[PDB]
Design a protein around this ligand. Structure first.
Ligand code: 2XT
Ligand code: 2XT
Lengths: 133, 133
């Protein structure tokens, strides 16, 4: 279990940047953002080799303990054994996730949060820097 | 009120770097480090004007919920309404706190922590970046 941060008070339009090292033998990692562990406006889960999935980004939400409808993206800008940065913002409609190699996508904001107050990391990603703007 | 982080997994000799904004009207700010909120190897409290102190850094420990004996430092390289970086490392004997303008001091590792897993900020300091070397 990785870095957990609370009281982030990330407001709409503000950018959260996370840089970390993807393990050489990475199978998958997770960043979770929301209010708390039961209330996630974004579960961001790059799977290198996990749950039968290869090089696929899986996203979902969690509302009051309940997983939402999973979505998958079609580009995988991560390499095992490399440094990677992820930049996330939000407004009421969407979270915007910016990734390496120029890639960016939106994930619908399915929760009702005023601010993002909680982050949690897990899996094969060693966090080196977190910045809150 | 400020950022709280857990699972930091900071080990001896590793450097924790915290940058933030000292409020324009700053009276006092706090960085706490330790095992958890009740076991602090460092309560780092620069006081511009607070609790009977002017321009003084007060340091303490907290062991099983009980405050230790305060140590007052001899230097104060902080100003209201500025950016500041604090860098912290530790070993068996001491925490070393590096401050702006080349200042540093040591505070004894009273709890004999071999790992720092918790950090929390409070007061007139807005954390903008946290980095691990
Ligand atoms: C009959 C259809 C079954 O579909 C499958 O159902 C699985 C179980 O629900 C889906 O897997 C889950 O997808 C969720 C997002 O939709 C989460 O990713 C679930 O894992 C949550 C989790 C585990 N961990 C610990 C962890 C994570 C990464 C590395 C190391 C530890 N942290 N969060 C993950 O278990 C999996 O994505 C899903 N696959 C498909 C293609 O739909
Ligand atoms: C009138 C003289 C009595 O002596 C005073 O007794 C106080 C209470 O024990 C001493 O203050 C406490 O010292 C502790 C360390 O030894 C902690 O600094 C106590 O504050 C804990 C705290 C409050 N906060 C919230 C906060 C922090 C900064 C700004 C705004 C909110 N966070 N941590 C702080 O209230 C204060 O250090 C002490 N001063 C002197 C000069 O001896």
């Amino acid at each position: 279990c990785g870095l957990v941060a609370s009281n982030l008070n990330l407001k709409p339009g503000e950018c959260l940047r996370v840089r970390g090292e993807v393990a050489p033998d990475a199978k998958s990692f997770v960043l979770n953002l929301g209010k708390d562990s039961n209330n996630l406006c974004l579960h961001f889960n790059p799977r290198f080799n996990a749950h039968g999935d290869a090089n696929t980004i899986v996203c979902n939400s969690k509302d009051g303990g309940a997983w939402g409808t999973e979505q998958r993206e079609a580009v995988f800008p991560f390499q095992p054994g490399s440094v990677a940065e992820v930049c996330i913002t939000f407004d009421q409609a969407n979270l915007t996730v910016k990734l390496p190699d120029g890639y960016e996508f939106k994930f619908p904001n399915r929760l009702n949060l005023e601010a993002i107050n909680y982050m949690a990391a897990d899996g094969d990603f060693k966090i080196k820097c977190v910045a809150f703007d």
